Amino acid sequence: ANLAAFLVLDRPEERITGINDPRLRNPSDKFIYATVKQSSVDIYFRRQVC
Amino acid sequence: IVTIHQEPFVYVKPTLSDGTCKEEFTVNGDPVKKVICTGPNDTSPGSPRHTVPQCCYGFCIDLLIKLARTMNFTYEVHLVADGKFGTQERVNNSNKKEWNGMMGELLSGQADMIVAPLTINNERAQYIEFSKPFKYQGLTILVKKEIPRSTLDSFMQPFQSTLWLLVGLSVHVVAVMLYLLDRFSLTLSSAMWFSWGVLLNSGIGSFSARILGMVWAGFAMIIVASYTANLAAFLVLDRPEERITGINDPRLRNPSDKFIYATVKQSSVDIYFRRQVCLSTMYRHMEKHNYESAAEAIQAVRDNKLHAFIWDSAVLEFEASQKCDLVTTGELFFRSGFGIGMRKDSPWKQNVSLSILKSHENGFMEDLDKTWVRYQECTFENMAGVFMLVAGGIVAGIFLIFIEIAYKRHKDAR
Amino acid sequence: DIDNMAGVFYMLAAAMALSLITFIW
Amino acid sequence: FSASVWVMMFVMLLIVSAIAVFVFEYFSPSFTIGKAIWLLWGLVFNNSVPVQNTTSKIMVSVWAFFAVIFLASYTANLAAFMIQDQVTGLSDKKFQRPHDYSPPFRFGTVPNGSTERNIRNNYPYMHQYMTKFNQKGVEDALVSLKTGKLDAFIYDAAVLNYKAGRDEGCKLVTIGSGYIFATTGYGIALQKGSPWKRQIDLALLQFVGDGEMEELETCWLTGICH
C-alpha cells in the first residue's frame, strides 16, 4: 500500500500554469525568466495596470 | 422593535397556557433569557391572522438586553406580517417607490430600532442609516450531499462477457490439447483437476507436459492481475459529483432544468443579482421558482425538491453544523456585514455604536458565537449482493454435486 | 479490455510453436 | 476504515466457516476438529501451505477463487483509501500560564500600536509579559521566526495573511480562519462634522455591491500557498 501510494504521488513539478500564476507574480532568484529585448511583449508588460 | 423570524438567530416557540415560556438551561446550566413576543399566529396569507403572544429568543436578544442594561430602554418586540426584509416594490399606479416589509414598517414610524439580521446595502443605506456590523459573513451555496455506496457490482462479469467466454474457450482448448498430448505421450480427470488447481491455488496435484504447465502457470496470473488493476482503477475513479465550485462556475452561468436554484424573496442578494453587468439569465432562471421563508426553502432542499440555495454564509454554516446531511460548498463573495435600522434623526447613533464596539472588543461577541452557533459539529451493495449471489450459487452447486455423486456411486456399485 | 485479446493471442503462437517442437522431437 | 468493512467481513467469515465445516463433516462417506480449522485459513492466506490436500476439490477451488477475489478487492480498497494547528485562540492556558511548561513562551509585537493597547485594556498581565519581549518591525519578527528566535507573533490579521501568502516555502501559516479575537475593519478616518462622510460611505457601498474591487484583491493580495 505504501509503495502504491508513493508511486501514485510523484513530484508533478509544474513551472507555469498560466498568466495568472501566483508564483510568476513574485520575483524569485531560484526561477529566472525574461524576454530577449524590446518587442511587442515588452510593450505589453510596460502597459500593465498592476 | 420589529424582528424577523430567523432560525439560527431568533427562535420562536409558542407560549404555555399561563402565557409565558419555559425556563430552559444551556450546557453550562445558565438561565436562558426569554422576552415576550408579539406577532401574527399564521405567516401564510388567507388565514385568520391573530396577534397571539409568542416567545422569541436567540442571539440578538442577548445584545438587546445588554443595550437595555447599559442605557435605559423600554422595548417591545414585533413580528412582520409578511415575513420579508423589505425592498422597493411596484403596485397599482406603478409610478410609486414605496418600501414594504420591515423596512417599510421602520419608515412608517411604527418601529424605531431594529435588532435583527439585516445585510447592509447601498439602497437601504440611502434612506435608513446603519451602525457598525456585528460580524462579517458573506453569502455561499448550500447543496445536499449524496452518499456513494456502490457502483458496478462484480458478481460474475461486471465489465464484459465476451472476455469471459474467450477465457473459457481458451481453458477448454488448452485442457483438451493437454489431454491429447498425454494420450499421445492423466487420462482420467486428474489432468483437469491439476489444471484447476494451478488456476486456483488449492494444493492439489516427460518434457512435453513441462512446457505446457509452464506456459499455463505464466498465463494464469495475468488475468487476475488485470482484474485487480481494473478493480483498483474503478475504485479510485469515483463519481466525485460537485454541484457548485464557486461564483464563477460555468454550470451556474447557464439555466438548466435539471438543477434548479434560487433565493426566497427580495433581499440584499436580490439587489446584488439585479446589479450585475452581464449576469442576466440568472433572474430568468430564478424568478420561476420562489418561496416564502428560509425554513421552507431548506425543507424543500432536504426533500430533494431543490438542488442549491443562496443565503448568508453564517446561516448555512449553522444549518450544516446542526444537520450533518447538508454541506456548504463554494467560497465567500460579496462579503458584507450586518447593521441596525434606525431613523436618520435618531440621537442614538453614537450611544449605540460605542456600546456595540465595547461589546465587540470585550469578548462578548465571541462568547455569544461560541454559545449560540458552535453547539455541535460533524459497500452497501457491491460487496453484499454479489456475495449473496455467490453463496446461493455455491449452495446450488453443492446440492447438485451431492445428488450427482449419490447417483454415480450407486451406478458404479450396483 | 481491447488489449486483452492481443495479450492472449500473443502467447498462443509461442504455445503452438512449443507444441509443434515437442511433437516433432 | 475498519468500522464498516470489518464488521460485515467478520460475520461473512463466520458463515462461510460454518458452511465449510458442515460440508466437511458431510464429506465423511482427515478429522473435522483440526483439518477443517486448518483449511479455513490455509487458502485465504496465500503465504501458507497448511492445506496438504470430487466434491472436496470443487468446494476448495471455488473457495480459493472467492478468497483471491476478496484479496484483490481488499488491495483495491487499500489503494483507493490513500487519496487524502498548535494553539486555538487566546483562551488557551498556554498563553496565560507560560511557566507551566519547561520551554518558556516568548511573544512579539510592535509597540505604540493598537494590539498592545487592546491587550492592556483586557489583560494587564499579558501586557506585562509582552513588555519583556518586543519587536520594532515586521521584518524583525519574520527574521526571528525564520531563525527560531520567536515562538509566536501577534499582529493584525490582514498583514499576517499577506505575509503568509507571500511567504517562501509555505512554512509560516496562521491557525485557520474565523478565530479572530475581534473582527474589525479599517474605514476612512475623517474630521468631525465633515459632510463628506455620507458620500464616502455611499461610494464605498456602491463599490462593494458592484464588486469593482475584485481585480485589486486578486492582483495586490495574491501569492504562493493558497
Next chain:
Amino acid sequence: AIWLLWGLVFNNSVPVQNTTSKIMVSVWAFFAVIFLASYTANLAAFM
C-alpha cells in the same frame, strides 16, 4: 531447478514440493513477493 524457478514466484501454484537451500529459497521468495508488490504498484500508477 526449472520447476522451482517458477513454482514460488507465481503464488498461484504448488510446484515446489520441497539449511543452505532453505535460506536461498526463502530470500528468493521474499524478492519475488517484493517484485510482485512493485508490479502491482506500477500497474496502479499506470492505470
